[PDB]
Design a protein around this ligand. Structure first.
Ligand code: PP9
Ligand code: CHD
Ligand code: CHD
Ligand code: CHD
Ligand code: FES
Ligand code: FES
Lengths: 359, 359
């Protein structure tokens, strides 16, 4: 039976093989929204050519590529299974992957959705916490696709642009934290200090009103409440690159710091993303828990499992979508407010594309 | 009946009159908890004599000095009435005011509590969101005192060192917001944008590990939940001074930004303090809502009323203590963890002072 309701799962994406590395850097650097380069159409391809080795090396050290497609899919399948059962008048459901910077590209997936002749399309970001650099960008990609192509959308669109405190999302996190706690030696369970590590931002983006830091902060608190404050915590930020100021403290600096001060049992909890990817498999597990931790005198260091294939995250996804359909919401109230200091003419356009949709 | 339990309400303070402005600044600049100035004992007396006229002129602009004590007092009487009826086991309850930089000073308050022969002393911060510049500084004073004085405490000690999301505190902010939304023209209510405005911290404090941003953000979220996201929002930060980098967006920049983008209806909600003080009556109500937004084209800017005399906030305060007392805790789990990049030797000592009280 032909697909009625499409769910576009948005994520930035990662290179699947080492061969996909160059074209991933290229799209990243060609993007005027993300970075502003002099002679951008000449520099981007050369900067990418030069950075490819450094980055292949990173995927090399985790086994040759990203797994976000495998997990994103596995999540998709469970979601659809559930929804067709939760919501028959909107069945059958299909999921589509819209990676921002690798195949299948956002623009490629939208192309398929229209082709399948769906009635309703739901843009569903896989970042629980909104940032203009992530979700903002995927949403812009959609507006741009229909502007680019110069035709109207043949489906009734909407978005779940954020959901940083979803009750089941909160649960999956708590369960993974708890069960990982049970893996620390009993004589240190109480001593365990928790570091919620989220992808950092450049200060210039923060200072502009990006809604991310407040939302990631919102999530941490909700999880800690469910844990009944069983251990102390901190929210720290990973992934700074280059000399400019970014939001702190730095996940690494914070690891070293605590070690120097005798807090040698650190559990790392990846709160800003739902699946494994480079930020956990290389940055946290290798460059931090392996080396760093070795040269700082660490005792135990562990990393709560990413949600990945946990069936409860499946439920979370179906629940969100289901409720979103039950509410007739077109986008969060939050999306209707662009960052107070936003330059970038397109943000308004996108916000209008979503609030203006038919029905 | 002599007092049994003593409730030390901690807060930074503000000059009660134009004449108190000098000593207030002199005491801020002498704090090794906040300012590392060369030859500090000589610099601060100068840097005060110098800044004093600027600061006086501000208080003038708001009637003549700080309302902090008037509100702290009242809030305190209400809390005690209720406590005596909620927890009669703790016998008569007395409230003491410990301001950090004006009389009655924490030091003075501790003397008075001592020579009252209380059985129990509670260090209650009047800052729901913990920062090492606010609550920490108050707590360091409690320790520093009993250490300098050579004696040891003659009464059981403990702290409610934080409470960013206490449900009655949430009810109060939401209640004032709703009330303030009824003062906008009907036709503009849904178009009202909310800015929660918290006193900012310098980036170096944020980057060092400070709890504040994550907690403030927690509060914002709970408050917006209760309001069921009726209007869009951002969390923004006020009161930057000097040339160094601070956590933004600056609140002023945000007002002016929203305004330039045609979001010309704004409701300021001070979310990190529980009374009027200089930051609201001058900064927000006068430099921002009067001078600034007038020359920017603003249609309506209001400010949610500070918690002040709200009887329900009194209940909140009593509610926090009754629970603190019944649960027997000495402090939060969060206090038992210092900033990962903390460089201040007293933070260890102060934590110990609380984690290790008898009973
Ligand atoms: C390290 C982090 C912080 C530093 C270094 C800090 C420094 C200051 N705080 C001041 C005043 C103040 N700070 C105040 C509440 C806070 N202050 C806070 C965080 C900081 N405040 C937080 C968090 C607050 C509560 C939310 C208030 C209410 C005043 C009143 C100052 C005045 O003019 O009376 C002044 C006056 C300086 C001047 O010359 O104008 C300085 C320098
Ligand atoms: C670090 C990297 C150069 C890689 C290398 O020399 O190995 C450069 C090239 C493009 C840069 C990015 C772009 O300048 C855009 C961003 C602008 C912000 O103010 C800094 C971070 C920001 C996200 C940059 C981070 C980093 O410096 C990048 C990624
Ligand atoms: C891959 C490259 C690092 C190159 C280097 O270390 O030399 C980095 C530098 C800035 C990065 C970007 C910034 O972190 C901003 C975005 C943050 C998201 O978590 C991923 C996509 C996101 C768009 C990043 C893509 C990619 O990881 C970039 C472009
Ligand atoms: C600008 C003013 C001095 C002006 C004068 O001498 O007349 C100075 C005096 C003490 C300063 C503070 C001290 O330098 C200590 C802090 C150091 C941080 O890097 C910035 C905030 C910080 C809290 C400063 C803010 C601001 O620059 C202050 C308030
Ligand atoms: S940059 Fe955030 S809305 Fe445009
Ligand atoms: S500065 Fe935060 S604990 Fe010392």
């Amino acid at each position: 039976r032909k697909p009625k309701t499409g769910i576009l799962m948005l994520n930035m994406g990662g290179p699947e093989t080492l061969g996909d590395v160059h074209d991933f850097l290229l799209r990243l650097f060609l993007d005027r929204d993300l970075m502003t380069l002099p002679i951008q159409n000449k520099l981007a391809p050369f900067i990418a050519k030069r950075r490819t080795p450094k980055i292949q090396e990173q995927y090399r050290r985790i086994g040759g590529g990203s797994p976000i497609k495998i997990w994103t899919s596995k999540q998709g399948e469970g979601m659809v299974k559930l929804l067709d059962e939760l919501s028959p008048n909107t069945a059958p459901h299909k999921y589509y992957i819209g990676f921002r910077y690798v195949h299948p590209l956002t623009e490629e997936a939208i192309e398929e959705m229209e082709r399948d002749g769906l009635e309703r399309a739901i843009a569903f970001t896989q970042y629980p916490q909104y940032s203009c650099s992530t979700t903002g960008s995927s949403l812009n990609a959609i507006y741009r696709y229909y502007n680019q192509v110069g035709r109207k959308p043949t489906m009734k669109w909407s978005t779940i642009d954020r959901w940083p405190t979803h009750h089941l999302l909160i649960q999956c996190f708590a369960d993974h934290i708890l069960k990982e706690l049970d893996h620390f030696p009993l004589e240190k369970r109480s001593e365990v200090v928790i570091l919620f590590s989220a992808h950092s931002l450049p200060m210039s983006v923060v200072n502009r009103g990006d809604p991310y830091p407040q939302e990631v902060s919102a999530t941490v608190q909700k999880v800690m409440e469910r844990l009944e404050y069983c251990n102390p915590y901190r929210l720290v930020w990973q992934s700074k690159v280059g000399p400019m100021p970014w939001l702190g403290p730095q996940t690494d600096e914070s690891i070293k710091g605590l070690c120097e001060r005798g807090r040698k049992n650190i559990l790392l909890v990846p709160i800003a993303f739902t699946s494994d990817h480079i930020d956990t498999l290389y940055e946290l597990d290798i460059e931090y828990s392996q080396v760093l931790a070795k040269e700082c005198g660490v005792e135990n260091i562990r990393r709560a499992e990413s949600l990945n294939g946990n069936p409860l995250f499946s439920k979370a996804l179906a629940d969100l979508v289901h409720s979103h359909i039950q509410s007739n919401e077109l986008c969060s109230k939050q999306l209707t407010l662009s960052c107070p200091l936003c330059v970038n003419p397109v943000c308004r356009e996108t916000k209008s594309f979503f609030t203006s949709q038919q029905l």
